[PDB]
Amino acid sequence: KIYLIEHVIGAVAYDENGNIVDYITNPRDLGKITEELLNNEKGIPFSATVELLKKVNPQEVVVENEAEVPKLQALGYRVSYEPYSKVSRIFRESLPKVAIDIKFASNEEDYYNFLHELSLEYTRRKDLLAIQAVRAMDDIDKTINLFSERLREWYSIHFPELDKLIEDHEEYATIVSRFGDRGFLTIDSLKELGFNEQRINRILDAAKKSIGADISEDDLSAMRMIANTILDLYNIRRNLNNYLEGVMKEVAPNVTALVGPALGARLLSIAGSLDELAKMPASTIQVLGAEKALFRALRSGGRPPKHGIIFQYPAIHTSPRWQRGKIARALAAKLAIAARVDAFSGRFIGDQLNEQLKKRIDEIKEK
């Protein structure tokens, strides 16, 4: 009499005593195990079990599951089942261990790594990239600014007047990247990026009358490394935005209809997932970001933030201070609905949502 076990680990045959008579180890493949587990539910035996019942030639076999019995009878054997058998327990008692013994994994460390990922995939069968992307975007934003701030402080040793003349960081960087020295600056080369007639003249005059320092080619190229990094990041940023837009429309279209890909993703990031954002009340969504401000208010009974990361929505930060709280409240409300239609499936209804929102905003603005 042979007591048969089925597990992620493979197919093991025990005698009545609880000694492994023979085993066949499963392949360490997520795809195949998951399928065989799904199949086992309907009574279909593992393919490892089929091979094992051949190697041993047992007259009376006893399995764990009652659905398996008629399947193994159709295969030629006399079969029964015992529910919470001593054998089945004996096997699981030594299950941290017997994974290594039958060589399913080399050590315990990555038996559990595999089993964790099996479980993850096995329940998946029965938005993260959007989050990561925006998080990197935010890192890039932060860095562009840090480097541009540095570059201006650095490059102004040579050409100080250029700093207050070029507002735009990308433009400023393009100039240091293409030229270095201020005596390399030309009407021709500057037209070749679209700086307007009058501005080119002010730049060149400022470079002529500059009270900057005369400096080696080694010094300038040091600076130009930063300028090129800044230029690289701007391109990477724009690429990340388009990628983000792609995923965001796919994963949460209604939200994206409301606040754009970036800010939408940003809310997902803070919430942790789409389903988590979907479970939230508007009054939470309205304050995400701004945690320092919130808990300060909640601890002391002071005044709460009107808006967290939502501040970024154009209608809020451009509007006067007494309109902002209303706009925020209306936005958050709609976002909660947006997140929920996005989460609990499918339909795009972002057009009416926008329309309702802009109605609410137009009313707010007429006072």
Binding site: N40, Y84, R89, L115, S119, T123, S273, D275
Partner: protein, 227 residues
């Protein structure tokens, strides 16, 4: 602020800016919270605030649970893992060594458990019916603690069945008794008595019986040892 160990492993109390005391656990995934809970740094180590009103285990502790059978490197079978609130705290307590097997049969909710379990190698999510331990027999191992919080009229019987499958002899079972989802008609206190008797008439040795009030209305938790 001040954080210090308690009688139980990996479970801490906070003195606060104002003079309040709240439970917390050692954050297994620093910088990341599962529900809305407060994250707290003290001496460069991060702790997750353990709200008793949400987590029945935190409740039971605050109602004076003698000895907690969930500690460093413990293996737990968690029936009724839900969205992952309490199970995330037992993940913190158990640390990378130990393992938690979260059984939960509501897909709407396992949705959010997934997110918790991705971030945490401790937790092995399972979308299955706790009434059929056969359907997860093939993923789990035997365990030290059977933590059972499932809304079912025959919840106790379900728990005993899982026990004789997976609970180690001399292991412990924390069983949450939900009076109102066994029977809204009967008195909560008559229910606690009759369910405990089911455990005793099996062979579970009732260690402690706590009433979860303030924190959970019409609830009691039983701690007992399987023989």
């Amino acid at each position: 602020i001040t954080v210090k160990q308690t009688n139980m492993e990996n479970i801490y109390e906070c003195e606060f800016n104002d003079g309040s005391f709240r439970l917390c656990t050692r954050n297994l995934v620093p910088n990341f919270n599962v529900y809305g809970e407060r994250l707290i740094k003290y001496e460069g180590v991060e702790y997750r605030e353990w709200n008793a009103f949400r987590s029945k285990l935190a409740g039971a502790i605050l109602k004076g649970l003698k000895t907690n059978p969930i500690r460093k490197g413990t293996k737990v079978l968690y029936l009724g893992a839900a969205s992952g609130t309490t199970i995330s705290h037992v993940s913190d307590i158990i640390e990378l060594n130990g393992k938690a097997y979260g059984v939960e049969f509501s897909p709407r909710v396992v949705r959010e458990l997934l997110l918790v379990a991705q971030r945490r190698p401790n937790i092995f999510p399972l979308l299955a019916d706790a009434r059929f331990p056969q359907s997860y027999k093939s993923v789990v191992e035997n365990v030290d603690v059977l933590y059972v919080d499932i809304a079912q009229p025959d919840q106790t019987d379900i728990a005993i069945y899982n026990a004789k499958f997976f609970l180690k002899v001399n292991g412990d079972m924390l069983l949450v008794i939900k009076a109102r989802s066994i029977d809204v008609t009967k008195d909560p206190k008559e229910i606690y008595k009759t369910e405990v008797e089911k455990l005793e008439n099996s062979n579970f040795e009732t260690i402690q019986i706590i009433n979860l009030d303030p924190y959970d209305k019409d609830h009691a938790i039983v701690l007992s040892k399987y023989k």
